[PDB]
Design a protein around this ligand. Structure first.
Ligand SMILES: O=c1cc(O)n([C@@H]2O[C@H](COP(=O)(O)O)[C@@H](O)[C@H]2O)c(=O)[nH]1
Ligand SMILES: O=c1cc(O)n([C@@H]2O[C@H](COP(=O)(O)O)[C@@H](O)[C@H]2O)c(=O)[nH]1
Lengths: 213, 213
């Protein structure tokens, strides 16, 4: 089958390794630590040499609209961007969404985070923001499986991406089983002795889990 | 003495900054700047400057591991801004610990300046701030009543307030409402003569402060 993995590239991997990974990943999530290390120019060059379904730039955008737009205009190599939902619509997400739509870029909104300290106190407000903005997708922690299932019910056509797998405790495939489309995986791949073997192993586990699912 | 923190969200010349250094409290480094110049040239530009405080503002809003990875790359700065919404355990707690270990200041975004910022989480945010006990907080200068309220609630905290000029805030009103410093971007860096703009703004702030004091 086809991979459900989005590589969280928060640290550089060699072109050699990434080249082999191309056809065994759904996408790559480009993180701020990576871009700070390589610079925008070299980040773009790196990705140009790669062929994956989706390149997602994730700077966890959470500012006024002007600043979020200023950031994304500098990163045209991405297909999609991640922003927070909690910042709200007027003068923040509305401006960003307008710009991204005008430039044929996708938006993902952070709905529920993976760490224990995240509050789900404001799900009604968060859902309204999401419903209002109408992003391509949302981020829902793979450590919060019940939230994944809840969000999939409340948003049937939404792309759901789920991080917190491996390092943070999520067992590979549980998020997809609970309703996510893709699982975001960072350290368990890029810090592995052999990141390629790590990816191939994970793809197997996910395949197995989904079937028992 | 200046109460202005220059929001450097686009490059300005070393030439100009050197004249500005003695007429500013501090400089807030924005993400578009660092994307443009790269980290190493950002370092070079700013360490070569003499201001009281350099605050790196990438609106930190991730898990602890990632937020720490980000700030470790910009440790020349004195202070960092993070969102309070993301919560404590596994996020802000790890960041605060790391920042403390390195004698860095943390500012938490408490109330944002745009219209879409919800008052719904006011109590939750206050709790996070009490739990973390950061050096300062960010409270929108377009939200003067919130500044005053937050000043009463956290009399010992540094309050910095953006939204002055471009977003409609009148220079000095934020300080008069009880903020220590005002954050100002476009009104200065997009001015025909940024130096003149800053001097004009400093004059306006001084006049206002002398009246509200
Ligand atoms: O709630 C969230 C949202 C995220 O985007 N992420 C991101 O998912 C990735 C997880 O990386 P790791 O597999 O090494 O735990 C990181 O890029 C992180 O910023 C997360 O961990 N939790
Ligand atoms: O609620 C907030 C919080 C901010 O940090 N800011 C920051 O304050 C600055 C405002 O710049 P400007 O004066 O050009 O509006 C920007 O760096 C922005 O990211 C804000 O505008 N509103």
């Amino acid at each position: 089958l086809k991979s459900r993995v989005i590589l969280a590239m928060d640290k550089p991997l060699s072109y050699q390794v990434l080249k082999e990974m191309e056809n065994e990943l759904y996408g790559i999530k480009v993180g701020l630590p990576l871009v700070l290390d390589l610079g925008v120019d070299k980040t773009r060059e790196l990705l140009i040499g790669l062929d994956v379904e989706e390149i997602i730039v994730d700077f966890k955008l959470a500012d006024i609209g002007y600043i979020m737009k200023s950031i994304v205009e500098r990163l045209s190599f991405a297909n999609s961007f991640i922003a927070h939902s909690f910042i709200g619509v007027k003068g923040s997400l509305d401006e960003l969404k307008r710009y991204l739509d005008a430039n044929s870029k996708n938006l993902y909104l952070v709905a529920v985070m993976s760490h224990e300290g995240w509050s789900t106190l404001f799900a009604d407000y968060i859902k309204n923001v999401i419903r209002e903005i109408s992003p391509k997708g949302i981020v829902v922690g793979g450590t919060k499986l019940d939230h994944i299932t809840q969000y999939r019910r409340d948003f049937e056509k939404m792309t759901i991406v789920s991080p917190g797998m491996g390092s943070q405790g999520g067992s590979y495939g549980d998020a997809v089983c609970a309703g996510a489309d893709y699982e975001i995986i960072g350290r368990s791949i890029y810090n592995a002795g052999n990141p390629l073997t790590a990816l191939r192993t994970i793809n197997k586990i996910i395949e197995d889990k989904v079937m028992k699912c």
